[PDB]
A paper describes a structure:
Non-ribosomal peptide synthetases are important enzymes for the assembly of complex peptide natural products. Within these multi-modular assembly lines, condensation domains perform the central function of chain assembly, typically by forming a peptide bond between two peptidyl carrier protein ([name])-bound substrates. To address this, we report the structure and biochemical characterization of complexes of a [name] domain bearing a stable analog of the acyl acceptor complexed to the acceptor site of a C domain from the NRPS that biosynthesizes fuscachelin in the thermophile [name]. The C3 domain of the didomain resembles other members of its class, comprising a pseudo-dimer of CAT domains with bridge (R2923 to T2944) and floor loop (A2843 to L2858) regions.
To verify the role of the R2577 in controlling access to the catalytic channel, we generated the Arg to Gly mutant ([name]) of the C3 domain. To control the modification state of the PCP2 domain, the mutant PCP2-C3 didomain construct was expressed in the entD mutant of E. coli. Similar to the wild-type construct, the protein expressed well and crystallized in the same conditions. The structure of the [name] mutant is very similar to that of the wild-type protein, with the PCP2 domain sitting at the acceptor site of the C3 domain (RMSD (all atoms) 1.2 Å compared to wild type). The first noticeable difference is a small rotation of the [name] domain in relation to the C domain and slight alterations in the [name] interacting regions of the C domain, likely attributable to the [name] mutation allowing the first helix of the C domain to sit deeper in the acceptor channel. The major difference, however, is the positioning of the PPant moiety, which now fully extends thought the acceptor channel into the active site in a similar way to that seen in the ObiF1, SrfA-C, and AB3403 structures. This observation supports the hypothesis that R2577 acts to control substrate access to the active site of the C domain. Firstly, we confirmed that the [name] mutant C domain retained activity (with Gly), although this was reduced compared to the wild-type C domain (32%), possibly due to the loss of stabilizing interactions with the PPant arm. Whilst this residue is largely conserved in LCL domains, it is typically Gly or other small residues in DCL domains, which we have confirmed allows the unmodified PPant into the C-domain active site.
Author numbering: 2481 to 2552, 2557 to 2999
Write the structure that this text describes.
């Protein structure tokens, strides 16, 4: 759970009166001392509701280390040569949504970088090979058996990488979306595909990485670009990249997680314990919410979608951060509360279940590596009683901290335990997702050129609605709404995401007004 790390950063920043607090900055090196350590502990106890002590801060003086400590489950260890691949339960759920609900390429994740230079295709191909050699998860196939899916780790010399140039014919943003949507056959193809887009209207090139989600979450963007940059620069100079072996492969992480999780039939295992919480917490859940769609739910889901964006003025982004600090919540919690208000005002009622991904990256061996570490949680917020926005923030905090203490039970096991009525055109337990994302910083000079990330207007959709508050890595932010085209017209989606901005604006202006 990254939320613990954000709060520790937030408390460090307020106590130290510093705005340059990063997850690996040492409290005392930043100007902390015993007197201020009392304030850090008191604030953390007040915001997290757990027993925090000076001993924790002394022994774990960085936000990443302290967040891992307050949570902690065994550390991830390398299993060594010829340890067999292990498919994680999170990977299992992704393979399974796609097999069962036939999501086409909706779970492909794009990473697009405009480059001022056209890159060398043969050098790029060599660098992708190095990248795949480094990260086993990028060359692990998934094959169907009659027990479930089996991983198949390809040796680096047997991994056939797919790197190609594509001439742009029309608007590049549409082409990026179409390339992103092409489905993978994970039984025969590695889950990474690379395209360099060139054309008359393109100055330089657009480098597009398409991963299947089974191999990467959005926190993988930073190591992916970092390692690809290193391999490209080395191969352009005629040599193999000079890197240090990974502290762990994804299979090392998966093996540790599964051994800690235990079995569902063991009443003392963390899995059964967290499953029992979720069975209680999701009792009498709505099958779906009463959303203002342009069309009723079809019998068959097409997974077509669009993407509507709402730009946020810098002033509003700071007001949202200020509101979060002032009420002792994360930016995600504010956005979550705002989405709940929006849906509530549109007639969805007082019981609002919102899905949200949660990253399992606290362990230092995987904190900054490539892979899919997201579990999905149902955050059930209640809006009965005419609460103010400040009231709702307290409610959302409590709901989220309870859920975060129980974030290892795989979502597919939660759905199985809760046993909702199933329908191929409705995602179970929730149909609106909310997340916070933050794009990599210092990715403006990759490959020896001038570079910048470009967002991709997805042609697909996973749910009815997916809201994302996305920070761009250099101060800016926008809200992205990935909506199901079966339910919403694009102009309705533009209105919805503008309304979410209005809720946020009203909330910062006066949090004491009633929802
Ligand atoms: P933190 O580790 O920054 O704490 C500093 C301290 C309070 C431990 C230290 O500055 C301090 O005052 N230690 C006590 C010194 C002492 O007991 N001498 C008194 C002679 S009776």
């Amino acid at each position: 759970v990254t939320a613990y790390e954000e709060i520790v950063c937030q408390v460090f920043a307020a106590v130290l009166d510093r705005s340059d607090v990063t997850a690996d900055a040492d409290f005392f090196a930043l100007g902390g001392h015993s007197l201020l350590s009392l304030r850090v502990v008191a604030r953390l106890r007040a915001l997290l509701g757990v027993d925090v002590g000076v001993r924790d801060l002394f022994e774990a003086p960085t936000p990443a280390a302290l967040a891992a400590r307050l949570t902690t489950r065994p550390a991830v260890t390398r299993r060594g040569p010829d340890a067999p691949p292990v498919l994680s339960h999170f990977q299992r759920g992704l393979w399974l949504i796609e097999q069962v609900y036939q999501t086409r390429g909706a779970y492909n994740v794009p990473l697009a970088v405009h480059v001022s230079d056209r890159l060398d295709l043969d050098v790029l191909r060599a660098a992708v090979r190095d990248l795949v050699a480094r990260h086993e998860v990028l060359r692990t196939l998934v094959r169907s058996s009659d027990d479930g899916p089996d991983p198949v780790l390809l040796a680096p010399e047997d991994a056939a990488v797919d790197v190609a140039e594509v001439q742009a014919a029309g608007p590049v943003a549409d082409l990026l979306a179409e390339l992103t949507a092409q489905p993978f056959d994970l039984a025969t193809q590695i889950p990474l595909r690379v395209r360099m887009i060139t054309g008359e209207q393109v100055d330089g090139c657009v480098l597009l990485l398409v991963c299947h989600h089974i191999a990467a979450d959005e926190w993988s963007f930073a190591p992916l670009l970092r390692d690809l940059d290193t391999a490209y620069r080395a191969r352009a100079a005629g040599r193999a990249p000079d890197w240090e072996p990974l502290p762990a492969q994804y299979s090392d992480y998966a093996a540790t997680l599964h051994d800690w999780l235990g079995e569902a039939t063991d009443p003392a295992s963390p899995l059964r314990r967290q499953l029992d919480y979720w069975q209680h917490a999701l009792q009498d859940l709505p099958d779906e919410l009463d959303l203002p769609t342009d069309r009723p739910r079809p019998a068959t889901a097409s997974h077509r979608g669009g993407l509507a964006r709402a730009e946020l003025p810098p002033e509003l982004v700071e007001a949202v951060r200020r509101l979060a600090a002032q009420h002792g919540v994360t930016v995600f919690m504010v956005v979550q509360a705002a989405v709940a208000v929006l849906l509530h005002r549109l007639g969805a009622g007082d019981d609002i279940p919102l899905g949200s991904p949660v990253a399992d990256r606290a362990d230092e061996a995987v904190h900054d590596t490539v892979g899919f570490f997201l579990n999905t949680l149902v955050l059930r917020v209640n809006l009965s009683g005419n609460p103010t926005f400040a009231d709702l923030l307290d409610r959302v905090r409590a709901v989220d901290l309870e859920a975060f203490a129980r974030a290892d039970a795989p979502f597919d096991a939660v759905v199985d335990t809760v046993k909702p009525p199933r329908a191929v055109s409705r995602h179970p337990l929730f149909q609106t997702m909310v997340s916070y994302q933050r794009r990599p910083s210092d990715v403006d000079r990759l490959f020896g050129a001038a570079t910048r990330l470009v967002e991709v207007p997805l042609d697909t959709a996973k749910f009815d609605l997916e809201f994302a508050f996305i920070e761009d890595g250099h101060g800016g932010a926008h809200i992205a709404l990935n909506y199901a085209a079966d339910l919403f017209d694009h102009d309705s989606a533009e209105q919805l995401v503008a309304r979410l901005r209005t809720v946020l604006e009203h909330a910062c202006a006066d949090p004491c007004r009633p929802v």
